[PDB]
Design a protein around this ligand. Sequence first.
Ligand code: ACO
Ligand code: CMP
Length: 324
Amino acid sequence: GARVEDLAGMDVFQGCPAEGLVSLAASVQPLRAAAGQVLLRQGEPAVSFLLISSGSAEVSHVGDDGVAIIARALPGMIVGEIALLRDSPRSATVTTIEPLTGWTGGRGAFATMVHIPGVGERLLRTARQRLAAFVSPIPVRLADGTQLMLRPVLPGDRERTVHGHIQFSGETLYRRFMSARVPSPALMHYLSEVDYVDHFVWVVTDGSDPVADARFVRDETDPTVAEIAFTVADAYQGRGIGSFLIGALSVAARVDGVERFAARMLSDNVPMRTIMDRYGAVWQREDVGVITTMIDVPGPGELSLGREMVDQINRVARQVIEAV
Ligand SMILES: CC(=O)SCCNC(=O)CCNC(=O)[C@H](O)C(C)(C)COP(=O)(O)OP(=O)(O)OC[C@H]1O[C@@H](n2cnc3c(N)ncnc32)[C@H](O)[C@@H]1OP(=O)(O)O
Ligand SMILES: Nc1ncnc2c1ncn2[C@@H]1O[C@@H]2COP(=O)(O)O[C@H]2[C@H]1O
């Protein structure tokens, strides 16, 4: 098999004490593939997973719309884990780009891997982030006629925004973060790389570039409550996006077992206060210049969204949340 050292470098194994990797390392087998070799095919039954040492691969998923969604598998990453988590067929076709080496294992070695402390949770989180990219974005039409799309957040949204053309002003950032400075890389990682269970995020785009986001973060002590936050790009404000997003967030919260939303905001934020007032918010003074509220996540019919839109949002939330 491999050396414990050889596994120690894989993403999913970071921080894992050597001892826990012993049998796994002994049980995996070496793999070498040439360039342009198909490793896995979408829809096929599953046996093995692969830990990539070197080289890389294209990942290609054909969705219901018939469009192939493309991604990359890189050195340090596992591939073929999702089918083994779900007992499903392969979610994607995986083809080597350049020559690739690594280690493979079967369902037996996979069982060892998932019981390695901390690892099962990492596998699930990464699987969710991956499957999130295969969700069909939901068309949303604003009152003013603007056509946008609604989808779960993706780790890649950090890069898209930072290098994008959509502007978030100093004022917008202060209203959102209590600082006008551009959000640090560390913060942007935190905002875009999430588990969807405890921390859930919707992104609205123009069909390419993100223009807004909404998130809830489940409270540690009381799982039935979550803290919420919203951001909308300046040019996109005042068009109904925020009002839409609180509804979408409420749909996802229902799937996630979240009964109540908590919020804090500057006392001067009129648009946000108004959005929450619709849902029955009563305001407490928290710090100086900050106010807070708790509201019940609105149930059936008291959302202005309409059934078709509600069902689409519910279907997508479940796809990311419940996939594995
Ligand atoms: C809990 C936290 O998230 S606090 C921090 C929130 N984030 C920020 O403040 C950052 C900068 N601003 C924004 O991101 C956005 O403006 C948000 C999230 C505050 C609001 O979203 P928007 O898309 O602009 O709001 P939207 O157009 O849906 O209208 C909001 C509501 O207030 C009203 N409104 C719209 N513009 C304004 C305005 N300039 N001033 C006061 N009220 C307004 C609308 O009537 C609407 O009411 P409705 O729910 O009955 O339809
Ligand atoms: N968005 C993605 N990014 C990177 N790898 C992915 C992505 N989606 C799927 N995969 C990998 O492609 C594999 C195809 O088979 P599985 O569904 O077993 O497990 C899948 C993941 O390992």
